[PDB]
Ligand SMILES: *Cc1c(COP(=O)(O)O)cnc(C)c1O
Ligand SMILES: *Cc1c(COP(=O)(O)O)cnc(C)c1O
Ligand SMILES: [Cl-]
């Protein structure tokens with residue numbers, strides 16, 4: 001037991017979630033339920049690792065000890081049944097930096113790169129900002145409200161594509177893809193000699209009855225065709241420490257990314273990231289399991305509240321991530337109108353669905369990694385906004 | 388007064404200086420006097436800013452409050468008499484990453500970039516790793532042992548150059564360029580429409596009777612032709628925190644670098660870098676002044692020791708930086724022989740002059756930002772090596 005009910009003031013915590021809404025929504029005087037970090041304290045093991053490193057009193061250039069990558073190897077093996085080699089790992093300050101460099105190195109200007117919308121908006125922008133062409137294969141929104149891949153669409157568009165960027169679990173719709181769904185996609189990509197970059201940052205935030213399957217874990221051929229991005233940051237609420245890794249089982253790919261990070265001279269973890277990453281994987285599993293029980297309770301509470309109190313809204317329980325994807329289309333409001341009522345009448349900040357691209361219109365994304373009290377206040381504000 | 392004589396054992400401090408010699412020198416069992424970080428504890432104000440941040444116990448995405456760039460603006464004004472606008476500042480995790488992106492955006496493949504050797508080795512590799520053409524204008528080593536710029540050579544090689552990368556103060560030779568030296572260089576570059584990137588990371592480490600002059604501060608004409616990189620990291624020994632900034636008074640340059648950082652999605656300080664940077668500039672001046680007295684004492688001690696005890700070596704007192712550039716050529720040993728006898732017999736790890744490019748042969752670089760006891764030991768081991 002860790003006390004996830006505890007409310008922590010973040011008004012003095014140099015938090016973008018609490019302090020950068022003015023830019024985006026027009027004011028900071030809103031209840032923030034938008035950007036994906038949590039309103040929970042880091043695991044005690046993380047905090048103590050930071051304290052111990054702080055007490056050294058010298059903060060020079062940091063070497064990466066073998067125990068760091070060993071912690072990552074062991075995490076992936078015991079949590080995801082995927083045994084990797086330490087030699088396959090590259091440090092990156094974040095997932096999107098790594099994907100950016102990978103796009104620059106693995107493709108030529110104007111090459112086609114495929115994603116599936118609605119999705120995390122940096123997928124769309126990182127392609128365009130690198131002067132490659134973005135090809136969107138929208139997820140299919142079924143008449144039952146759920147989302148699946150559009151395999152027929154992918155096969156129709158795949159012929160001149162060079163890379164496919166997968167979100168697994170998929171933010172914002174909350175899908176934890178099954179082995180069979182991943183096998184179908186992976187076989188298509190292999191048939192067409194398309195490499196997959198799998199963004200698996202949400203890999204540890206998986207609800208009951210679901211299991212994360214790394215795309216690269218399915219078979220040795222999928223392993224060699226997949227470059228995987230993961231991090232401790234979403235799992236343990238340590239984005240402010242900046243730490244991620246890339247698993248590249250193909251040495252040609254490894255060399256290209258290693259050379260790219262040499263080119264921009266980004267090689268070392270900061271000193272706190274170093275210790276917190278190792279501490280989170282070696283010692284954070286008990287906190288994580290407790291977090292996932294608390295999160296599932298928040299999810300169930302939120303869905304029940306919505307279905308009882310805002311019955312015009314439609315919501316499907318996510319299989320993973322701590323983000324809820326809620327359909328407001330029955331209100332008959334344009335996306336701008338919906339944002340305006342939520343901000344001005346509700347005083348609540350949710351992520352606008354349209355920001356995730358095709359299939360986002362009419363939706364809003366709500367962050368449930370917060371104390372129940374804060375979640376309830378958010379739901380009350382939404383109820384007031386739409387009434 | 389601060390206790391610079393205190394030895395801080397860095398064996399458990401995940402320090403690259405103490406733990407990465409095996410790669411470069413064959414063995415970890417050497418006294419490290421190479422990589423430029425200090426063997427001193429951080430200023431109290433830094434340690435405590437980190438502790439107070441740590442005790443908030445939430446490490447999510449970090450906003451940059453106005454106070455952070457205000458600290459930088461105020462520092463540049465009161466320390467260097469250079470009044471900048473906060474709107475000119477772009478965050479970078481380091482100086483070389485910023486220069487790398489600057490090179491990619493301000494020039495085309497195979498364009499010419501000029502540097503002055505011997506110089507910090509990333510200046511050479513950042514140009515070549517970006518597939519630009521490197522035009523070296525060696526510094527002129529005078530028969531009195533000092534270094535000046537080779538203006539004739541610059542004028543002869545500059546006609547087709549796009550960018551000039553200036554080191555001010557110049558690592559490793561320790562020059563603090565005078566206003567007149569900088570004016571002469573700047574005018575040559577302006578005549579030929581050559582933009583100057585000025586790496587001024589050593590700007591605060593300035594010895595008595597010398598004064599740092601930002602190239603961009605000389606005039607408005609110079610300001611619009613100059614892009615400046617600075618950081619708290621060398622000053623305050625916080626390279627493990629990762630923080631630097633770029634001053635771009637030209638809005639077109641600002642937009643190109645802003646867009647580059649958007650492309651690789653590196654925008655936010657880590658949470659600890661944020662608080663330490665502001666604390667160092669708002670509260671660290673007293674520590675800095677004390678450090679500069681201790682450093683100058685160490686320099687005077689080392690030069691006296693060398694001239695008395697290793698009289699075939701030649702050394703000139705640095706005007707800036709904490710790095711001592713010592714000529715071993717009178718021993719009649721090759722660079723290879725020299726390196727062997729220092730590592731294997733002295734058991735001392737110095738930076739080999741040849742790593743700094745043209746004009747480095749015969750030289751070794753020693754880091755003097757350590758307790759006197761450690762400096763004495765290094766000098767004793769160098770003496771033992773060459774006897
Ligand atoms: C939050 C998030 C990230 C974070 O990216 P960084 O560049 O590591 O900050 C990456 N991918 C997805 C799908 C996310 O939701
Ligand atoms: C130490 C040093 C740097 C540091 O580079 P970062 O990329 O900030 O680590 C840059 N320039 C010079 C001249 C240096 O001596
Ligand atoms: Cl379904």
Ligand SMILES: [Cl-]
Nearest residue numbers: 310311312313
């Ligand atoms: Cl309703």
Ligand SMILES: [Cl-]
Nearest residue numbers: 530531532701
């Ligand atoms: Cl002489």
Ligand SMILES: [Cl-]
Nearest residue numbers: 697698699700
């Ligand atoms: Cl001698």
Ligand SMILES: [Mg+2]
Nearest residue numbers: 052053055056
């Ligand atoms: Mg301790």
Ligand SMILES: [Mg+2]
Nearest residue numbers: 187190219221
């Ligand atoms: Mg097959």
Ligand SMILES: [Mg+2]
Nearest residue numbers: 081217218219
């Ligand atoms: Mg397997």
Ligand SMILES: [Mg+2]
Nearest residue numbers: 307311312313
């Ligand atoms: Mg209903």
Ligand SMILES: [Mg+2]
Nearest residue numbers: 439440442443
């Ligand atoms: Mg406090």
Ligand SMILES: [Mg+2]
Nearest residue numbers: 019450451452
């Ligand atoms: Mg702000």
Ligand SMILES: [Mg+2]
Nearest residue numbers: 546579580581
């Ligand atoms: Mg010209």
Ligand SMILES: [Mg+2]
Nearest residue numbers: 694698699700
């Ligand atoms: Mg002599």
Ligand SMILES: [Mg+2]
Nearest residue numbers: 759760763764
């Ligand atoms: Mg003595």
